Tab-separated table of C-alpha atoms and ligand atoms in Angstrom:
chain	number	residue	atom	x	y	z
A	30	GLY	CA	0.060	-0.244	0.560
A	31	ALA	CA	0.988	3.792	-0.891
A	32	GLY	CA	0.547	5.210	3.003
A	33	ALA	CA	2.352	2.509	4.578
A	34	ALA	CA	4.600	5.061	5.645
A	35	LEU	CA	1.368	6.498	7.371
A	36	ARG	CA	1.217	2.422	8.552
A	37	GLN	CA	4.869	3.042	9.997
A	38	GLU	CA	4.353	6.092	11.565
A	39	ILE	CA	1.615	4.925	14.092
A	40	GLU	CA	3.206	2.677	15.375
A	41	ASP	CA	6.397	4.803	15.897
A	42	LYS	CA	4.393	6.123	18.175
A	43	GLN	CA	2.040	4.274	19.670
A	44	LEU	CA	5.129	3.092	20.744
A	45	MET	CA	6.533	5.969	22.375
A	46	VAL	CA	2.971	6.528	23.707
A	47	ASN	CA	3.826	3.154	25.287
A	48	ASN	CA	7.419	4.326	26.767
A	49	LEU	CA	5.434	7.638	28.638
A	50	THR	CA	2.639	5.141	29.261
A	51	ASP	CA	5.451	2.574	31.628
A	52	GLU	CA	7.582	5.529	32.325
A	53	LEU	CA	3.995	7.572	33.944
A	54	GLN	CA	3.030	4.122	36.141
A	55	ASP	CA	6.436	3.570	37.313
A	56	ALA	CA	6.414	7.442	38.595
A	57	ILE	CA	3.281	6.249	39.939
A	58	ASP	CA	4.625	3.821	41.337
A	59	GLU	CA	7.834	5.029	42.822
A	60	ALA	CA	5.220	8.256	44.103
A	61	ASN	CA	7.220	10.721	42.512
A	62	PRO	CA	4.414	13.024	41.684
A	63	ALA	CA	6.973	16.102	39.987
A	64	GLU	CA	8.022	13.009	37.139
A	65	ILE	CA	3.981	12.117	37.026
A	66	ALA	CA	3.667	15.785	35.877
A	67	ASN	CA	6.382	15.610	34.056
A	68	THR	CA	5.726	12.239	32.307
A	69	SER	CA	1.408	12.693	31.532
A	70	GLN	CA	1.945	16.292	30.128
A	71	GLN	CA	3.868	14.697	27.132
A	72	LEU	CA	1.899	11.890	26.942
A	73	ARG	CA	-1.153	13.843	26.151
A	74	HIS	CA	1.147	15.359	23.574
A	75	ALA	CA	2.103	12.112	22.088
A	76	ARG	CA	-1.597	10.363	22.860
A	77	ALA	CA	-2.523	13.571	20.410
A	78	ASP	CA	-0.130	13.289	17.705
A	79	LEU	CA	-1.147	9.668	17.782
A	80	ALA	CA	-4.944	10.111	17.266
A	81	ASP	CA	-4.195	12.711	14.665
A	82	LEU	CA	-2.497	10.279	12.444
A	83	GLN	CA	-4.975	7.569	12.656
A	84	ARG	CA	-7.359	10.339	11.750
A	85	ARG	CA	-5.175	10.307	8.588
A	86	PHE	CA	-5.461	6.660	8.295
A	87	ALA	CA	-9.330	6.279	8.465
A	88	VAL	CA	-8.988	9.414	5.558
A	89	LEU	CA	-7.710	6.110	3.035
A	90	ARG	CA	-9.435	4.136	4.157
A	91	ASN	CA	-12.483	5.932	2.821
B	26	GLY	CA	30.169	3.365	19.462
B	27	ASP	CA	27.138	2.162	18.043
B	28	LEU	CA	27.552	-0.393	15.269
B	29	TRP	CA	23.733	-0.915	14.620
B	30	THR	CA	20.820	1.366	11.952
B	31	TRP	CA	18.737	3.292	13.938
B	32	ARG	CA	15.762	5.805	13.664
B	33	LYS	CA	14.524	7.781	16.552
B	34	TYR	CA	11.115	7.608	17.105
B	35	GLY	CA	10.486	10.178	19.642
B	36	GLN	CA	12.637	12.316	22.762
B	37	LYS	CA	10.547	13.341	26.821
B	38	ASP	CA	12.085	16.501	27.956
B	39	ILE	CA	14.255	15.304	31.173
B	40	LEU	CA	13.565	16.816	34.702
B	41	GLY	CA	16.750	18.868	35.808
B	42	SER	CA	17.998	18.206	32.078
B	43	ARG	CA	17.965	20.586	29.167
B	44	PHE	CA	19.493	17.396	27.016
B	45	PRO	CA	16.350	15.292	26.123
B	46	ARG	CA	16.436	11.163	26.315
B	47	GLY	CA	16.147	9.821	22.095
B	48	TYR	CA	13.810	7.285	21.924
B	49	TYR	CA	15.118	5.079	18.781
B	50	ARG	CA	13.835	2.230	17.531
B	51	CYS	CA	16.252	-0.690	13.888
B	52	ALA	CA	16.229	0.472	11.402
B	53	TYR	CA	15.299	-2.591	10.062
B	54	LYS	CA	11.976	-2.919	12.825
B	55	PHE	CA	9.376	-2.964	9.834
B	56	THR	CA	11.557	-4.794	6.464
B	57	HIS	CA	12.881	-7.259	9.675
B	58	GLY	CA	10.439	-7.258	11.876
B	59	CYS	CA	13.129	-6.222	14.443
B	60	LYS	CA	12.369	-5.761	18.256
B	61	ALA	CA	15.294	-4.340	19.295
B	62	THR	CA	15.501	-0.110	21.063
B	63	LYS	CA	17.866	1.884	22.484
B	64	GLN	CA	17.618	5.388	24.485
B	65	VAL	CA	20.223	8.057	24.033
B	66	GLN	CA	21.213	10.205	27.223
B	67	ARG	CA	23.170	13.070	26.985
B	68	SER	CA	24.539	15.448	30.160
B	69	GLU	CA	24.800	19.367	29.623
B	70	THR	CA	27.310	19.161	32.807
B	71	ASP	CA	29.374	16.497	32.178
B	72	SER	CA	30.708	17.231	28.273
B	73	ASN	CA	32.542	13.454	27.420
B	74	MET	CA	30.125	11.039	28.893
B	75	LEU	CA	27.193	9.173	27.116
B	76	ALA	CA	24.081	7.030	28.920
B	77	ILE	CA	22.973	4.386	26.357
B	78	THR	CA	19.775	1.842	27.323
B	79	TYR	CA	19.524	-1.280	25.049
B	80	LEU	CA	16.152	-3.216	25.296
B	81	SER	CA	16.199	-6.433	22.918
B	82	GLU	CA	18.611	-7.957	20.757
B	83	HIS	CA	18.493	-7.087	16.642
B	84	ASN	CA	16.882	-10.494	14.971
B	85	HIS	CA	19.374	-10.262	12.082
B	86	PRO	CA	23.514	-8.758	11.661
B	87	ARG	CA	24.518	-5.484	11.760
B	88	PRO	CA	25.117	-4.099	8.702
B	89	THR	CA	27.924	-2.656	6.076
C	10	ZN	ZN1	17.926	-4.477	14.003
């Protein structure tokens, strides 16, 4: 498929979202409110990026 | 050193550093199904130090 790079980009982003989630949960286990704030904030941005790339894919399906 | 080919998939702003951590996955992640990743951290203070975390071995030899 032509837009197969969109499939790649998506998984790369989903991977970063997974790291940031791992760290956020690690930070919750460690009870590090400063690192909770830092990671949770950057996880919103990463997840929105992911959301945007998925919208683009749904477009091609149509 | 590092003899592999990587593609940066993200970075995180670390606390108490203007140097963000780089998140890298194998260039062959998609072509060969490679799982391998590494995290790279430089220190603004300690000039020559470089901290890398490798997760997972590669499912291929290193290329030319
Ligand atoms: Zn590899």
